[PDB]
Amino acid sequence: GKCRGLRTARKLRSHRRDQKWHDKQYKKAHLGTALKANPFGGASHAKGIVLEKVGVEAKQPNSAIRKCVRVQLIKNGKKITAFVPNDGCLNFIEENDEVLVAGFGRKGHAVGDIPGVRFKVVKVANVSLLALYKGKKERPR
Amino acid sequence: ARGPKKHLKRVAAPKHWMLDKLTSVFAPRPSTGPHKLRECLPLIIFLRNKLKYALTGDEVKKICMQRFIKIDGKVRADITYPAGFMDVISIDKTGENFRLIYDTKGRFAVHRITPEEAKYKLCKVRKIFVGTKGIPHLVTHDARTIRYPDPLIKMNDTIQIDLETGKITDFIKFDTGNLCMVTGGANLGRIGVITNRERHPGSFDVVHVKDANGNSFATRLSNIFVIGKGNKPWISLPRGKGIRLTIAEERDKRLAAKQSSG
Amino acid sequence: DIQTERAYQKQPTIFQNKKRVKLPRYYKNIGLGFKTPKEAIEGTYIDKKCPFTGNVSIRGRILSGVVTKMKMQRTIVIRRDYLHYIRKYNRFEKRHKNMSVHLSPCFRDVQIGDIVTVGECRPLSKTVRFNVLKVTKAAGTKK
Amino acid sequence: GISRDNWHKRRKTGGKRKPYHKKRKYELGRPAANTKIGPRRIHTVRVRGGNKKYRALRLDVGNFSWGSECCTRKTRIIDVVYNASNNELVRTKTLVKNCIVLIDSTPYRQWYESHYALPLGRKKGAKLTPEEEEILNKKRSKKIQKKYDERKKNAKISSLLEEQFQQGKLLACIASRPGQCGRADGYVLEGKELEFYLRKIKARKG
Amino acid sequence: PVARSWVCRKTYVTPRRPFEKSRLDQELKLIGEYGLRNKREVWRVKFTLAKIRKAARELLTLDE
RNA sequence: UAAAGUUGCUGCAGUUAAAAAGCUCGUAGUUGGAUCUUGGGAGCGGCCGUCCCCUGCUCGGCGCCGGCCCGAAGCGUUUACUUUGAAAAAAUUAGAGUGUUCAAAGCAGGCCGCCUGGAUACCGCAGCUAGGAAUAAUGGAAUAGGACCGCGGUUCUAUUUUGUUG
RNA sequence: GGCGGCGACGACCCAUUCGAACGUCUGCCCUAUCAACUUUCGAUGGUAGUCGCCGUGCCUACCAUGGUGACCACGGGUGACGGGGAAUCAGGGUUCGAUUCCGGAGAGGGAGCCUGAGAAACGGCUACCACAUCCAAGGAAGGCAGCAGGCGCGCAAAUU
RNA sequence: AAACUGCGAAUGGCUCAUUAAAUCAGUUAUGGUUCCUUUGGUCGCUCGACUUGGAUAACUGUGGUAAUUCU
């Protein structure tokens, strides 16, 4: 600290209180802007309906076409590019199918190659995309 | 709540009942009566937890409705009747008589008294009142409105009533050097001679009490009861004698008694 | 001099219309070793909310403060300064609670800055719960 | 209904309160009695604790006290003259505590004329024609006429009451709450009180 | 408002660094030597010691 | 949540990495120089260490020929600070005891009817209480309406007192 | 014919118990892109009433011009019921506490009242607003934020 | 059995919408109040019929409405 007075408790406290809004992590989690703006509306997961399948160009140096899905959510109706994770799993997704979407890892931030893609696809039509990939469950048809 | 509460939660029950955690959601809520909710011990808890004559609270209903239990000279048939300090429980068909005296810990203990001792009990007075035609009135710690008492009896004196008639026989006056059972706070169950009164206009008067091993301690005058003139008590005392051996000395005596016995 | 209200002002206890051939004044000791002043006994004022010559009993808390305003009639605003301990920043902060307190007109000579003792009682008004018991005059101010 | 609540209204600071609970029962107002002068109509009201409370709505008599020589009698209330609280509770003749009412004098005049045996009121010139209290002024024994004489020595009444007893109507101060207890009891104004309230009735008059 | 306990504690603590070669060495030594079945079994004996040890150090701050 | 001494009271930074107002004044806020009790009397242990002491004015008991020695209630700067005491629901946490077969738990149990347990600690601040008086605030007597002295007077007044009744 | 034991029930009032209510001191998160607010539809006082179980601008009438504020009033926000507590934690702290104990509040939204010691009760009543059920079309009945259970909502939660 | 009378139905349970000196916590007060119940008092304290009055419910019996814990 800088004021070491014995009666400086409101100066020391009110200063910290004021300067704590220059912390980015705090301001995010203590304003209503980051939460009202969040597509998931402050949830871990969210279900939405697949409307088209998109091929996103990898940022650069590594140049592949990442098979994401444009998803309209149920709760808000907001539109989301959600990455289909594992190898050749865009075959398991058709149009107008409910997908459970999760975050990618970096808490509302683009992860590696994929630009402007913050989310991944977990389940397709109440069947886990791992079980489809491994072939432990088959798609309900 | 928008009226009086009729249940007591097992957890919210006072600690000095020593009710377990796991048997029931509810504790026996003491019926209204002479003693306070958190200063009494219901008949049910005396009859099935302390003495274990019952197993359940339906057994205690069967015991008490045979009219075999007689608290301070009159038969009650309420399982949640508040039996409190200095009360005499006479279980007559067993031929037994119990006084509710505080052990060295804050609980009431199983203190067996002789049928002669069980005929009188000692009562701290709460206030002196002058009734509707110059009639002097006492009010004891167990709500006995005793009218035409001895004029020397003042508040914080104790009076020896005979159960059968409900009339005063003797009385200890609140003076220094008199024995004192502490009936409230951290010192609940201590016995010692009153060595000092410390007056506080408005606030609560505190009373220093020397013990039978020179262990002097203070107490709020509200939480004090005189049990004999000088050094001789007017009741029989439980083992420990309200002297309060420390936890180091308790460990020593418990360990000495276990190892020596076998 | 007095009795400027539409109703008649008098002490309720003392009776002043006994047949003849100076009115007697009710007072009391307040308790807690606080001396009833001379101006309460010898004076001619009439205040139902005086703790010496009124229908109010001092019980519970005795506090003090510094008289800061005297613009309300028969009542004053005192100011209680204290130090609240924030334990994070192992320090105090200066904090104050100003309370409206009734000022008995037996205390004729009271100036702002005088350290007044006050006694808890029944609520006299919406915001008043305290009567003045004694006034100790400010540091110096003998003139 | 009409509430007696401390929460509906601003703080010291002038900050409005948000109410946290709806109107409780015990936070109760009942409409004002506004009791009048007429044939005795008192309505019992149940209050908190199953206790009773008597709303007088009309009330024409009261147990008033003449405190000088400590006598009190049931006397007819005839007119409300002055109310210190509201000036418009005189026109609408509403009995409340600390009202200034005219009452009958004849119970006190009867007591005085029977206890002191001296003609009080009674405008000078006239006589008593029934000859009842004319005989109650005279015809005593030896030692009891001496008792009335020893009493008569210090039997002076004030010229203010002498005037009011002459008109047949005393000024009384209501001490009971007729809204609450259902009674219109009080005391008779004397000395500084009477001089004060006669000055206030005179100032209101013009 | 049920008449149950809910009171329960963990008996182990997972270590901060999950892949310390020297820790994996010494704990598998303890398991093989005293014939245990998992690392939780060493971690709980370590936690019983740390409780005893924490209690003992708390007493050493107090005067004789 | 820790890691984050990357919100910094402990405890961070601000020449050049992000950062000292263009400069000065200034009211709250915050922080404020030094200075006002010290040397001893007495004893124990082997010159040193712990211990006892540096205010007065109704009723009593170690008593003595109205006083002295002693105790009790009261009066005796204000706090802050510290130390003690009173008081503060349980459950939770710490923790005592106790082989639920171990353990988490539980509050039980243990002896060839009896013997026991159901402890104890902690419970920030604020309020109550009694030591201490360094440290920090604060007070006085400076046109002397200053003390402590005994005196001269005045006004109101418990009533102890004139065999009882003015 | 007179006189009597042991109870049950009821009862004015007092005390006691169970409380409840209104007050005392102290303590709460973010916000100044909220700095002045409160006040003749009470704001702070005084006097006298009304009402109330009582104390009090609680409410009248009449006076007074007060009351609160950079020591952060007033206004706004809260994914705010509060506390005991919980998670992490060397020492400090940070975060959480809808949740079994205590206290508070509400029964779809406001409002009003009956009875009673205790209610502004909703497994009481009366309206209005909202939604909705039987109907022979005249009417009648409703309140699962009780236990199950259904729909909806959802990432998210069990047996009519 | 039913019905009248008395008592209970104001506790318990559920939820967290409201609520930021409010609620709540420690702390006091009630000498400023109310209190069924319980406990103990009081219950020939007043100076003036060896048991009174007539309703109503269950019951019995006629019914009405599509319908109600309607009457």
CA distances from A55 to A52, A83, A124, D11, E29 (A): 10, 10, 18, 64, 52
Cα(B83)–Cα(B49) distance, integer angstroms: 14
Nearest CA in chain C to B204: C60
**Residue at D194: amino acid letter:** L
Nearest CA in chain C to D66: C17
Which positions of strand F lie within 7 Å of protein CB atoms? 6-14, 29-32, 73-75, 80, 85-96, 103-108, 115-120, 124-130, 138-143, 145
Based on the number of CB atoms within 10 Å of its own CB, is E44 exposed (0-12), middle (13-18) or buried (19 or more)? middle
User: Is E8 part of the contact surface with chain B (CB cutoff 8 Å)?
Assistant: no
**What residues make up the domain containing C52?**
1-143
User: Is C32 part of the contact surface with chain B (CB cutoff 8 Å)?
Assistant: yes
Based on the number of CB atoms within 10 Å of its own CB, is B232 exposed (0-12), middle (13-18) or buried (19 or more)? exposed
User: Is E5 part of the contact surface with chain B (CB cutoff 8 Å)?
Assistant: yes
Q: What's the CA angle centered on A6, arms A5 and A7, to 5 degrees?
A: 90
Q: Where are the alpha helices (DSSP H) in D32-91?
A: none
User: Is C18 part of the contact surface with chain A (CB cutoff 8 Å)?
Assistant: no
- Spatial distance from the CA of D1 to the C1' of G126 (Å): 14
Question: Is strand G less than 7 A from the beta carbon of C5?
Answer: yes
Cα(D58)–Cα(B147) distance, integer angstroms: 45
Which 8-state DSSP code applies to residue B176? T
**Number of C-beta neighbours around residue B177 at 10 A:** 11
Classify each residue of C75-107 as buried b or exposed e, where b means 16 or more C-beta atoms within 10 Å of its C-beta. bbbbeeeeeeeeeebebbbeeeeebbbbbbbbb
Q: Where are the alpha helices (DSSP H) in chain C?
A: 38-42
Residue found under tokens 């309460």: C40
Coarse DSSP helix, strand, coil percentages of chain A, rounded to the nearest 5 percent: 25, 30, 45
State the distance between the two ends of chain E, measured CA to CA, in whole angstroms: 46
From chain C, the residues in CB contact with B201 under 8 A are: 31-33
Residue found under tokens 């219109």: D184
CATH topology assigned to domain D106-168: Phosducin; domain 2 (1.10.168)
Nearest CA in chain B to C59: B202
SS3 A28: helix
Residue found under tokens 């305290």: C130
Looking at the DSSP assignment, which residues form a beta bridge with residue D144? none
**Number of C-beta neighbours around residue D64 at 10 A:** 27
Residue found under tokens 């709020």: B220
Measure B202 CA to nearest chain C CA, in Å: 7
D111 phi, psi to nearest 5 deg? -65, -50
- Domains detected in chain B: 1-116 (3.10.290.10), 121-171 (2.40.50.740), 174-244 (2.30.30.30)
The answer to whether the Cβ–Cβ distance between C7 and D68 falls below 8 Å is: no
Structure tokens at B135: 């009639």
SS3 E30: helix
B229 phi, psi to nearest 5 deg? -75, 130
Structure tokens at B140: 């004891």
Looking at the DSSP assignment, which residues form a beta bridge with residue C67? C78
Entry field: residues in chain C = 143
Neighbours of chain A (3+ CB pairs under 8 A): C
Q: Of C84, C88, C91, which is closest to A6 when you measure between CB atoms?
A: C91
Entry field: residues in chain B = 262
Which residues have CB under 8 Å from B222's CB, separation 6+?
B184, B204
Looking at the DSSP assignment, which residues form a beta bridge with residue A56? A66
Neighbours of chain B (3+ CB pairs under 8 A): C, E
Strands (E), chain B: 8-9, 26-27, 41-42, 69-71, 82-83, 88-91, 96-99, 111-112, 120-130, 136-140, 158-162, 167-172, 179-182, 191-198, 206-210, 224-225
Which residues have CB under 8 Å from A21's CB, separation 6+?
A27
| Chain A, chain C: beta-carbon pairs less than 8 Å apart | 29
SS3 D82: strand
Which residues have CB under 8 Å from B80's CB, separation 6+?
B28, B29, B30, B31, B42, B43, B44
The answer to whether the Cβ–Cβ distance between C86 and A6 falls below 8 Å is: no
Structure tokens at D114: 């029977």
The answer to whether the Cβ–Cβ distance between E3 and B25 falls below 8 Å is: yes
Residue nearest to nucleotide G92 (CA to C1'): C88
Do the chains C and A touch each other, judged by at least 3 C-beta pairs below 8 angstroms? yes
Please name the helix (run of DSSP H) or strand (run of DSSP E) that holds residue C70, with its range, or none. none
Domain ranges of chain D: 1-30, 31-105+169-206, 106-168
**Number of C-beta neighbours around residue B136 at 10 A:** 15
Cα(B98)–Cα(B262) distance, integer angstroms: 31
Measure D89 CA to nearest chain C CA, in Å: 14
> What's the number of domains chain A is made of?
1
The answer to whether the Cβ–Cβ distance between E3 and B10 falls below 8 Å is: yes
Which positions of strand H lie within 7 Å of protein CB atoms? 9-14, 18-23, 28-32, 34-42, 45
Cα(A113)–Cα(A83) distance, integer angstroms: 11
Structure tokens at B200: 């506080």
DSSP D142-179: HHHHHHHHHHHHT-PPPHHHHHHHHHTEEEEEE-S-TT
Q: Which residue, among C24, C13, C11, C10, has the nearest Cα to D196 in the 3D structure?
A: C10
Q: Where are the alpha helices (DSSP H) in chain D?
A: 106-115, 142-153, 159-167, 191-205
CA A56 to chain centre: 16
- Spatial distance from the CA of A1 to the C1' of G26 (Å): 29
Q: Is the dihedral of CA C6, C12, C15, C16 positive or negative?
A: negative
The answer to whether the Cβ–Cβ distance between C59 and B202 falls below 8 Å is: yes
Do the chains C and D touch each other, judged by at least 3 C-beta pairs below 8 angstroms? yes
Question: Is strand H less than 7 A from the beta carbon of B34?
Answer: yes
Q: What is the CATH number of the domain that holds C18?
A: 2.40.50.1000
HSE-up (13 A, CA, CB side) for residue B219? 28
Entry field: residues in chain E = 64
Q: Which residue, among C8, C38, C44, C39, has the nearest Cα to C25 in the 3D structure?
A: C44
**What residues make up the domain containing A13?**
1-141
Q: Report the C-alpha dihedral over residues E38, E39, E45, E51, rounded to 10 degrees.
A: -140
Structure tokens at B227: 């049990």
**Residue at D78: amino acid letter:** I
Which residues have CB under 8 Å from D192's CB, separation 6+?
C8, C16
Cα(B5)–Cα(B12) distance, integer angstroms: 13
For residues B156 and B174, the answer to whether their CB atoms sit within 8 Å is: yes
Residue found under tokens 């999950």: E18
HSE-up (13 A, CA, CB side) for residue A64? 8
Question: Is strand H less than 7 A from the beta carbon of D130?
Answer: no
Question: Is strand H less than 7 A from the beta carbon of B4?
Answer: yes
> What's the number of domains chain C is made of?
1
Cα(E24)–Cα(E30) distance, integer angstroms: 10
Residue found under tokens 């959600």: A82
Please indicate the experimental technique that yielded this structure: cryo-EM
* Preferred mutation among D196, D197, D201, D202 to probe C, highest tally of C CBs within 10 A: D196
Resolution stated for this PDB structure, in Å: 3.2
A29 phi, psi to nearest 5 deg? -80, -10
**Number of C-beta neighbours around residue E46 at 10 A:** 17
Which 8-state DSSP code applies to residue A58? P
From chain C, the residues in CB contact with D193 under 8 A are: 8, 10, 16-17
- Spatial distance from the CA of C41 to the C1' of F108 (Å): 71
A6 phi, psi to nearest 5 deg? -75, -25
CA distances from B162 to B37, B92, B227 (A): 25, 18, 16
Strands A119-124 and B26-27: unpaired
Which residues have CB under 8 Å from A124's CB, separation 6+?
A92, A93, A97, A98, A99, A132, A139
For residues C59 and B228, the answer to whether their CB atoms sit within 8 Å is: no
Q: What's the CA angle centered on D87, arms D190 and D35, to 5 degrees?
A: 80
Q: Is the dihedral of CA B84, B71, B140, D48 positive or negative?
A: positive
**Number of C-beta neighbours around residue D59 at 10 A:** 23
D36 phi, psi to nearest 5 deg? -115, 180
Radius of gyration in angstroms for the set of CA atoms belonging to chain B, rounded to a whole number: 19
Q: Which residue, among D30, D175, D165, has the nearest Cα to D95 in the 3D structure?
A: D175
User: Is A8 part of the contact surface with chain C (CB cutoff 8 Å)?
Assistant: yes
For residues A120 and A102, the answer to whether their CB atoms sit within 8 Å is: yes
CA distances from B159 to B124, B126, B167, D139 (A): 6, 11, 9, 65
| Chain B, chain E: beta-carbon pairs less than 8 Å apart | 11
HSE-up (13 A, CA, CB side) for residue B171? 21
| Chain C, chain D: beta-carbon pairs less than 8 Å apart | 31
Residues 85-114 of A with CB under 7 A from strand G: 100
Structure tokens at B199: 């007056």
- Spatial distance from the CA of E17 to the C1' of F6 (Å): 22
**Number of C-beta neighbours around residue B87 at 10 A:** 23
User: Is C87 part of the contact surface with chain A (CB cutoff 8 Å)?
Assistant: no
Question: Is strand H less than 7 A from the beta carbon of D11?
Answer: yes
Cα(D122)–Cα(D128) distance, integer angstroms: 9
State the distance between the two ends of chain D, measured CA to CA, in whole angstroms: 42
Which residues have CB under 8 Å from B86's CB, separation 6+?
B99, B100, B101, B121, B122, B123, B141, B142, B225, B235
Looking at the DSSP assignment, which residues form a beta bridge with residue C98? C79
For residues B158 and B149, the answer to whether their CB atoms sit within 8 Å is: no
For residues B75 and B59, the answer to whether their CB atoms sit within 8 Å is: no
Q: Which nucleotide is nearest to C85 (CA to C1')?
A: F125
Q: Which residue, among B189, B191, B241, B237, has the nearest Cα to B211 in the 3D structure?
A: B191
Question: Is strand G less than 7 A from the beta carbon of D47?
Answer: yes
Please name the helix (run of DSSP H) or strand (run of DSSP E) that holds residue E45, with its range, or none. helix E39-61
User: Is B203 part of the contact surface with chain C (CB cutoff 8 Å)?
Assistant: no
Structure tokens at A110: 């683009």
CA distances from D83 to A11, B133, D79 (A): 58, 41, 12
